[PDB]
A paper describes a structure:
[name] ([name]), a 14-kDa basic protein is an angiogenic ribonuclease and member of the bovine pancreatic ribonuclease (RNase A) family (also known as [name]). The enzymatic activity of [name] is several orders of magnitude lower than that of RNase A towards conventional RNase substrates, but essential for its angiogenic effect.
It forms part of the β5 strand and interacts with K82 and H84 from the neighboring β4 strand6. Based on previous mutagenesis studies, both K82 and H84 have been shown to have minor roles in catalysis. In the PD variant structure [name], the Gln side chain is flexible (can be observed in two possible conformations in the electron density map). However, shortening of the side chain length in the variant seems to have resulted with loss of interactions with H84 thus providing a possible explanation for the diminished catalytic activity of 52%.
Residue numbers in the entry: 0 to 121
The structure:
């Protein structure tokens, strides 16, 4: 299958297979590692677990159509939302971690997730 730049970016921005701790320091480190700190991204959620379950959101296997050309997963995922605190847009970026467990909303292209809808984690 063709490479998809937006799928690759989705993984960088929104996937962490096997996370350490899922506390504030986890968020502060991973947001730096994934290139999300210049400027500090205000909110960002990572999905955990295997990738095949996330990809399957794009199919009937693990998703349903949602709103205007989004998809909502049938399964629930372990997730961690990183929320910026402090009032400055610029590093150092301090984050509060909120771990969760629920279904997720994505957009897909050619069977691959290319966007995470952050609204459900705000």
């Amino acid at each position: 299958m063709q490479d998809n730049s937006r799928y690759t970016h989705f993984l960088t921005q929104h996937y962490d297979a096997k996370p350490q701790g899922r506390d504030d320091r986890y968020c502060e480190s991973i947001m730096r590692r994934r290139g999300l700190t210049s400027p500090c991204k205000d909110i960002n959620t990572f999905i955990h677990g295997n990738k095949r379950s996330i990809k399957a959101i794009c199919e009937n296997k693990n998703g349903n159509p949602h709103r205007e050309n989004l998809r909502i997963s049938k399964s629930s995922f372990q997730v961690t939302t990183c929320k910026l605190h402090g009032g400055s847009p610029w590093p150092p970026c301090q984050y509060q971690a909120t771990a969760g467990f629920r279904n997720v909303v994505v957009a897909c292209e050619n069977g691959l997730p290319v966007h995470l809808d952050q609204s459900i984690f705000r």
